[PDB]
Design a protein around this nucleic acid. Structure first.
Ligand SMILES: NC(=O)c1ccc[n+]([C@@H]2O[C@H](COP(=O)([O-])OP(=O)(O)OC[C@H]3O[C@@H](n4cnc5c(N)ncnc54)[C@H](O)[C@@H]3O)[C@@H](O)[C@H]2O)c1
Ligand SMILES: [Mg+2]
Ligand SMILES: [Mg+2]
Ligand SMILES: [Mg+2]
Ligand SMILES: [Mg+2]
Ligand SMILES: [Mg+2]
Ligand SMILES: [Mg+2]
Lengths: 123, 309, 248, 255, 58, 49
RNA sequence: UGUUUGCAAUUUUUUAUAGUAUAUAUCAAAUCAUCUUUAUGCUAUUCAUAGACCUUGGGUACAGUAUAAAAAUUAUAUAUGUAUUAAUUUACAUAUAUUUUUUCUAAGAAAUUAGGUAAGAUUUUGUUUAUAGAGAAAUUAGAUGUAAAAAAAAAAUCUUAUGAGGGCGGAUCCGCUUCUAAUAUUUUUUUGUAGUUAUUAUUAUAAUAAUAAUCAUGUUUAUUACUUAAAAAGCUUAAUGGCUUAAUCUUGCCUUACUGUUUGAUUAACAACAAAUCUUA
């Protein structure tokens, strides 16, 4: 009971009748937030257009490569489109071992570790 | 230029940044103290109402983005390191790994009506009702290709707990609700049972669990806590089953009570919950993907191991 | 602006979120409780360590914004306050530890490593906030590891073989698939034979390149950034691969 | 400390605070945000000068050079002009003082920025009301086959603003009303005002007839003008009154 | 008259997380601990590091 | 200068409370006369009620 | 001084001034319980003050990296140690309680409430995919697609018009009717399909062409519009019909589930009458 009463007190401060009220800004305060909200959503637009511009440029570099490759005769006696048809195959792309977990598991960090990189890694 | 003349000339954005001498005289704490009085209130005293009564009611509510609104939630406090990771390294790898080339002058693909109509010379066919979905009774969504305009991402996550024994012992529901509160940072909503089963002592229409939903950054942070702090600490964990997937780009899997108390938020105050009351949970990761093989390819990009099942 | 905006928003969450209940995390009159109450009083009641001093209630809750040049919103100041709050300030007996006998916590590692200071271009722990590219010199032009495609292999089987025959097998690498991310064409001189190079993307997770006993006539190597490739690779060679670059 | 300065809070704050422009209040996030919008306004202005010159080249370009000819030359200048009109709004839609100036009614309606915000304000509440009145009172199709208003019109009788569709006493409506109009497109134009009674009973033929209670043409108007008193359309305001104000009336028993 | 609900969110702190590799990053959580040291995580697990021999005991 | 504005604020309020009380006085007076009036009308059989 | 403390920002109204109807201020009401002691307390330091580490206390602090200068201040009954003074006065220190500040035992965890009105939501059943405990049977999460810069122009076919008060006969009614306008229809004769971002090619960062992307000045959990067979669920009880654009569901405020009289119908209710049903003023 004493431990359960402690839980119920945690749900009491979260009651709709006890949580803090909606903010009340004056004008100069309301306009300062309107200016900060307008610059944040603009910063997000710039980061979006940049983010999406690079993706479109990577995509076009792939297209220009896979368009040339589609019209290449070779190597040797292989006919036109061979390498192109071999590059468009998706064998193993949608399986369990598609992306190595040593690469995906390494998410970014604010500061590096004691050993940032392991040059002594051996096969 | 005449066009530049139509712009506002009293530009406040083109003003110089403040001065230091004038910044040293700006002391909001001293203004109120040295005032020795209360400033008169402004005659503008509009306050958002508690109810929305229509688009034509005299008193209208502002959008949730308005700070004075009742739905306002303060904006981002940080950048989740797993969203930055995906948008920085992985997004281009999925776009490169899953890429099918379309020649330049390829005509667009016109989708065909999935509810077919009767076509023919029989006079009956004219006013026949459209045919049923071929195969299943409900139409499944069609898969979109992964391109520079469709990168599958994580949208939200739903954590839920089903506690049937809470009908006998109401304390199991208070504890289950407090774990999902600390595990997620939201206030869960109680759920009820829907079917009667005498063998299982299950009565219908009685509170028997809770559920949360976290969106945006909160969902990316929850995955970081889960993939990198919780799942690695489960004893003899093989991975997420390869059978998971609803056929629309959403992944589901369940945890045990011995794995829910591994969450840093639950193991810090583990002594405040009674014994043998911390529940398990069902975690549904909803992605922007459009297939089971796209959602599995997305989680593999985040460090989620799968095992054949 | 991101640092100012986060800090600006962490104080709005102070005015709208429910208060902090210490009784839900610390048992009364214990080592954890006494440690919390001591460091809480030094913050003047604010249970948070990264928003300075601000009371969401009272006659002063309207003054929530900091002025220009405020160290409080910086990312160096919050980490200083989060580390100053992690040190145990109360021995397990319950008494305050002297101001001199307190153990400072191990501080985070710096973002700029030693290689960043020296400028070693053969090091992979350099420029940790950017993408590094492996260029190799062939007995001399800097380029990426290339090789002719035999009639037996494809583009992804040749790239995997060329890389091993060029930089050793001691690199934990991953060819990102079979699709080429860039290409460079050298027209023929009507004579001489032209070249149609198709580049495949690769990621390295551990190891280091090794040019000993390489089958191709390679001399040196280095790991460069995008801004550095522009000064090392040829103008036409660079114009063809730059579309493959990333944000960082 | 007179009323000409504003409200009491202003006159009180204007004497207990410092003289510092609102845009220079040394707040950290307010200034970092101001710099983001300052560097963006300079990028929109630089874009207006770039598209402006791009039109000069296309203008000097003879239609014979265009694959589509004169038709393809105007469809391309039409798109550049519109693109320019959008950058002129986006160059000031983020200004905090342009918003203050507009909300105070002190906005220059000769500029696209203030007319853009005036129409947005009008289309939020007052347009939805007039739209509902036109449909529920069957003004369409009775008077016009289709009608989508594009300017604001608020009429008042003896200083008292009347709501759209309100039943007014015959003594109140005995004098010509005063229209508070607002146009949202640039330039000066001539307006024509017509007041029509749509429910005049004609017992002889057992049907309703229409009757004009006011008619006036050649009323010059610009987006800067606000008030128009129909009494003064001949003497003060330039116009041609075809029919002076007739007091509205309704015989007993009719709807 | 549809009700306009308000959000009921508990107090959230900013926490420093130090993984087993010594790397650090900041998160947002409800627990009041300022620094969370992790001795066992994905950086020290054989299922996430199948090519790390230090963690391989055979 | 702030005390003057506050005195103007107090004066406008105290003035309204005075004119508001004077209006409430007259209303209670008119309600007292209306509820006290009694109109006895000739209904039938020479009876008044 | 209700309204957030740096400044004419919502709607209508009162009063006053200027002004000849407008303009500003002001007032009230609606929308909303935002919490408000400018310090009287706390904190750090120093000194008197005993003296082997004590009470009580007097100063000091100068505040944008805001500050010691309020992170939340009430009141009372009993008893006690110290000290007090002309006092169980006062302060201190507890223990026992009772208290206001509603601010700490989840009703936004419960009840299947069925009518009037207003707003909002619009496949809820079943089937099916997946999902710790979980199994034939428990919960949760899913299950259509499209569109969102912008048109311009010529003819024809009708149909409409309280359009031209059209014309000819017997302004408005009827029959003939030409013109104009509007909706619809044609696979119709077409014109245009940009701009922006980037890519490739050519030309000398700009121009031209081609290709791709493009609802987005907006807290992406976007939003908005249209579309998503039939059955089923729901709608007081069987069956049939109907409703999904409301007759279902949710919420707010309510009780018209009102009083009297009365119209036209149910091809003159039930193949009469009567009790009935619907409907108007
Ligand atoms: N959101 C929009 O206004 C918008 C406009 C046009 C297109 N889109 C499309 O939507 C998809 C992407 O949406 P998005 O661009 O809005 O994503 P977004 O990531 O920028 O916004 C989603 C969430 O990320 C947060 N966020 C963004 N930047 C952050 C930062 N630096 N630090 C911390 N948090 C941050 C946002 O506040 C929000 O919570 C794409 O298909 C894009 O083209 C979105
Ligand atoms: Mg963004
Ligand atoms: Mg269902
Ligand atoms: Mg099962
Ligand atoms: Mg009903
Ligand atoms: Mg109701
Ligand atoms: Mg009959």
């Amino acid at each position: 009971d004493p431990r359960i009463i402690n839980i119920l007190r945690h749900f009491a401060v979260l009651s709709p009748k006890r949580i803090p009220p909606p903010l009340r800004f004056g004008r100069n305060r309301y306009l300062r937030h309107w200016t900060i909200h307008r610059a944040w959503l603009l910063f997000r637009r710039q980061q979006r257009e940049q983010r999406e511009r690079i993706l479109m440029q990577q995509h076009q570099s792939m297209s220009n490569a896979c368009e040339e490759l589609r019209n290449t005769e070779g190597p040797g006696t292989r006919e036109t489109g061979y390498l192109y048809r071999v590059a468009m195959l998706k064998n193993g792309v949608y399986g369990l071992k598609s992306i190595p977990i040593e690469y995906a598991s390494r998410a970014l960090v604010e500061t590096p570790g004691r050993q940032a990189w392991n040059h002594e890694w051996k096969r | 230029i005449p066009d530049l003349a139509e712009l506002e000339t009293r530009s406040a954005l083109d003003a110089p940044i403040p001065s230091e001498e004038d910044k040293k005289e700006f002391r909001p704490w001293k203004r109120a103290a040295d005032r020795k009085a209360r400033l008169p209130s402004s005659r503008y005293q509009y306050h958002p109402p508690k109810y929305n009564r229509g688009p034509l009611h005299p008193i209208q509510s502002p959008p949730s983005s308005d700070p004075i609104a009742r739905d306002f939630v303060p904006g981002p406090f940080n950048m989740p390191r797993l969203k930055e990771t995906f948008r920085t390294v992985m997004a281009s790898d999925l776009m490169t790994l899953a890429y099918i080339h379309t020649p330049p002058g390829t005509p667009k693909k016109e989708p065909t009506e999935r509810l077919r109509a009767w076509e023919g010379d029989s006079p009956y066919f004219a006013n026949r009702a459209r045919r049923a979905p071929r195969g299943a009774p409900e139409l499944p969504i069609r898969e979109r290709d992964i391109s520079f305009r469709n990168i599958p991402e994580i949208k939200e996550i739903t954590v839920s707990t089903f506690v049937p024994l809470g009908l006998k012992n109401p304390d199991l529901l208070i504890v289950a609700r407090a774990v999902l509160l600390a595990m997620t940072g939201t206030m869960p909503e109680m759920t009820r049972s829907k079917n009667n089963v005498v063998q299982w002592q299950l009565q219908a229409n009685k509170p028997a669990g809770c559920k949360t939903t976290i969106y945006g950054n909160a969902a990316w942070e929850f995955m970081d806590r889960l993939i990198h702090l919780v799942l690695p600490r489960i004893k003899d964990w093989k991975g997420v089953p390869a059978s998971t997937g609803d056929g629309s780009g959403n992944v589901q899997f369940g945890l045990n009570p011995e794995d829910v108390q591994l969450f840093p938020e639950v193991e810090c105050n583990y002594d405040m919950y009674p014994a043998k009351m911390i529940p398990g949970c069902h975690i549904a990761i909803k992605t922007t993907a459009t297939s089971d093989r796209q959602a599995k390819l997305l989680l593999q990009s985040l460090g989620v191991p799968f095992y054949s099942n | 602006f991101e640092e100012s905006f986060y800090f600006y928003q962490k104080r709005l969450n102070e005015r709208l979120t429910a208060p902090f209940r210490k009784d839900f995390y610390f048992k009364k009159d214990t080592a954890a409780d006494l440690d919390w109450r001591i460091k809480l009083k030094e913050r003047h009641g604010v249970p948070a360590k990264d928003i300075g001093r601000y009371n969401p209630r009272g006659r002063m809750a309207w003054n929530d914004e900091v002025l220009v040049g405020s160290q409080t919103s910086s990312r160096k100041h919050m980490v200083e306050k989060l580390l100053a709050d992690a040190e145990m300030r109360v021995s397990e007996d319950g008494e305050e530890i002297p101001a001199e006998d307190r153990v400072p916590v191990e501080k985070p590692m710096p973002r700029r490593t030693e290689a960043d200071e020296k400028g070693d271009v053969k090091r992979l722990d350099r420029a940790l906030d950017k993408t590094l590219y492996l260029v190799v010199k062939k007995k001399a032009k800097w380029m990426f590891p290339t090789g002719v495609v035999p009639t037996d292999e494809g583009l992804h089987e040749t790239a995997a073989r060329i890389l091993a025959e060029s930089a050793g097998v001691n690199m934990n690498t991953w060819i990102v698939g079979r699709v080429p991310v860039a290409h460079h064409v050298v027209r023929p001189v009507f004579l001489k034979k032209g070249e149609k190079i198709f580049f495949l993307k690769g990621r390295i997770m551990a190891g280091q390149a090794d040019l000993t006993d390489n089958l191709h006539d390679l001399v040196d190597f280095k790991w460069l950034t995008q801004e550095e490739l522009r000064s090392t690779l040829a103008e036409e060679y660079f114009h063809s691969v730059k579309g493959m670059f990333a944000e960082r | 400390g007179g009323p000409e300065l504003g409200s009491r809070r202003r006159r009180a704050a204007l004497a207990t605070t410092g003289n510092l422009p609102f845009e220079q209040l040394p707040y950290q996030c307010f200034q970092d945000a101001r710099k983001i919008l300052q560097q963006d306004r300079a990028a929109k202005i630089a874009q207006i000068v770039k598209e402006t010159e791009k039109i000069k080249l296309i203008e000097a370009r003879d239609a014979s050079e265009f694959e589509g000819g004169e038709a393809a030359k105007q469809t391309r200048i039409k798109s550049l002009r519109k693109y320019i009109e959008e950058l002129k709004i986006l160059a000031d839609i983020n200004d905090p003082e342009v918003k203050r100036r507009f909300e105070d009614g002190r906005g220059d309606m000769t500029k696209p920025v203030y007319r853009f915000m005036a129409e947005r304000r009008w289309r939020s509440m007052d347009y939805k009301i007039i739209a509902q009145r036109i449909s529920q009172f069957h003004v369409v199709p009775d008077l016009l086959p289709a009608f989508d208003p594009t300017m604001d019109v608020k009429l008042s009788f003896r200083g008292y603003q009347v709501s759209p569709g309100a039943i007014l006493d015959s003594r109140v409506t005995e004098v010509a009303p005063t229209l508070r109009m607002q146009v949202f497109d640039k330039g000066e134009r001539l307006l024509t005002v017509v007041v029509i009674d749509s429910d005049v009973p004609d017992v002889t033929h057992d049907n309703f007839k229409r009757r004009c209670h006011f008619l006036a043409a050649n009323i010059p108007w610009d987006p800067s003008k606000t008030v128009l008193s129909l009494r003064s359309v001949g003497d003060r305001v330039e116009g041609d009154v075809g029919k002076p104000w007739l007091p509205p009336f309704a015989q007993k028993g009719s709807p | 008259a549809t009700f306009v609900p308000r959000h009921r969110r508990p107090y959230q702190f900013t926490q420093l997380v130090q993984l087993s590799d010594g790397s650090t990053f900041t998160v947002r959580t409800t627990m009041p601990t300022a620094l969370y040291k992790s001795a066992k995580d994905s950086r020290n697990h054989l299922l996430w590091q199948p090519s790390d021999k230090s963690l391989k005991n055979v | 200068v702030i005390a003057e504005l506050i005195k103007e604020k107090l004066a406008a309020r105290a003035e309204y409370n005075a004119r508001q009380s004077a209006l409430r006085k007259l209303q209670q007076q008119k309600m007292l006369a209306r509820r006290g009036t009694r109109v006895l009308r000739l209904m039938n059989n020479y009876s008044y009620r």
